[PDB]
Amino acid sequence: ALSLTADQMVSALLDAEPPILYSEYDPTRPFSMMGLLTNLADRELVHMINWAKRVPGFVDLTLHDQVHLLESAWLEILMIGLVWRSMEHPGKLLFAPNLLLDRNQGKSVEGMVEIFDMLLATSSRFRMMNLQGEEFVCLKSIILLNSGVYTFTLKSLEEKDHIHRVLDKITDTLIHLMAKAGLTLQQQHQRLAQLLLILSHIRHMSNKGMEHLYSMKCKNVVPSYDLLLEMLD
């Protein structure tokens, strides 16, 4: 994992990519949005577990630390995937290929249009930077490893060190991609910073969404430690 070259890191991330899923509704029947969005997120989560297990370095950690990282990052990971999928659809969010929604459609749930807006703005930022697919898979892996690393014994000290070494290797990889693309050293650092600073906004979006989900006060909303543990163990 730490002996991978930049090209090998990229290949491994592209190969791990999950599929794009469809919403489950009868397309021959007349057009609940939260129902549809919950079911889609439930099914994406299963595939996210399989993806995470294929990110280099991730299965080297303890199962408890794998669960902690996924618990912290899962909604950010869903959100970056949505933003990426929606990039060439100005003004719309491509939740699935059969579920392409505008901001007015989010107005149907109290608190949701604000989240829809923030997601559309991130998509439009990605569009303005001309984000590449190889840069997106790197960013997504960085979210997985970084989002829970500050909230965790000799074992833990070793786990945090390894997570930081893996993160350094993905930073190396990003820079390599930008060098292969022909950017100057100045441009390279500038773009790296631009990309990482968007991750702060993705955190914010997830925190805002988590607050909505927690406020629903429902045992079938938000995956528990135990469900994540069962799926990962």
Ligand X SMILES: Cc1c(O)ccc2c1CCN(CC(C)C)[C@@H]2c1ccc(/C=C/C(=O)O)cc1
Interaction of residue 79 with ligand X, rule CB under 6 A: yes
Alpha-carbon gap, residue 174 to 137, rounded angstroms: 10
Q: Is 191 annotated as a binding residue?
A: no
Which of 9, 16, 40, 52 is in the footprint of ligand X by CB under 6 A? 40
Alpha helix segments (H runs only) across 86-132: 103-106, 112-129
Alpha-carbon gap, residue 13 to 202, rounded angstroms: 20
Helix (DSSP H) and strand (DSSP E) numbers for the chain? 9, 2
Task: Give me the DSSP letters along 53-98.
Answer: TTSTTGGGS-HHHHHHHHHHHHHHHHHHHHHHHTTTSTTEEEEETT
CB of 202 to a copy of itself, least distance (A): 8
What are phi and psi for residue 75, nearest 5 degrees?
Answer: -75, -35
Out of a copy of itself, ligand X, none, what residue 209 binds, judged by CB under 5 to 8 A for its kind, is ligand X
Q: Count residues contacting ligand X (CB under 6 A)?
A: 18
CB of 116 to ligand X, least distance (A): 8
Which stretch of DSSP H or E encloses residue 156? helix 154-180
- Residue least distant from ligand X (Cβ): 209
Out of ligand X, a copy of itself, none, what residue 56 binds, judged by CB under 5 to 8 A for its kind, is none
Out of a copy of itself, ligand X, none, what residue 108 binds, judged by CB under 5 to 8 A for its kind, is none
Contact 41, 78 (CB under 8 A): yes
Interaction of residue 216 with a copy of itself, rule CB under 8 A: no
Toward a copy of itself, which CB reaches closer, 38 or 171? 171
Which of 6, 38, 71, 196 is in the footprint of ligand X by CB under 6 A? 38
Closest to 162 (Cα-Cα) out of 71, 65, 57: 57
Binding residues vs a copy of itself (CB under 8 A): 117-118, 121-122, 125, 142, 146-147, 150-151, 164, 167-168, 171-172, 175, 185-186, 188-190, 192-194, 196-201, 203-204, 207-208, 211
Binding residues vs ligand X (CB under 6 A): 37-38, 40-42, 44, 78-79, 82, 95, 112, 115, 209, 212-213, 221-223
